[PDB]
């Protein structure tokens, strides 16, 4: 059992590490989208003036 | 009206300026190529949001 647990724990780390990498990557993508969205809002305000 | 046209003309002129982005050759460690201001400013703003 110990052996198995050890094996599982070791496995858990790999998936979690890739999970964090994907999450941070996905977050970097969101940050870029929010910047563009704000850019369109500011342009619309200047067109109203 | 003239004041506004001058402002938009300045933006048009600034837009024609080609910003050169350096080729990511992996291997080449060191060359300190200077990052364009726009890329720096955009990166910082995106980092700040990412954090």
TrEMBL record, chain B:
Name assigned to this protein: HAUS augmin-like complex subunit 5
Source species: Xenopus laevis
Range covered out of full length: 155 to 205 of 666
């Amino acid at each position: 059992v110990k052996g198995d647990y050890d094996l599982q724990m070791a496995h858990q780390t790999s998936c979690s590490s890739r999970q964090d990498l994907v999450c941070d990557h996905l977050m970097k993508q969101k940050a870029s989208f929010e910047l563009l969205q704000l850019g369109y809002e500011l342009e619309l305000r200047k067109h109203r003036d | 009206i003239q004041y506004r046209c001058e402002q938009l003309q300045e933006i048009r002129r600034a837009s024609q300026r080609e910003v050169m982005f350096s080729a990511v050759d992996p291997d080449l460690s060191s060359s300190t190529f200077l990052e364009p201001e726009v890329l720096r400013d955009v990166r910082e703003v995106c980092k700040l949001r990412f954090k």
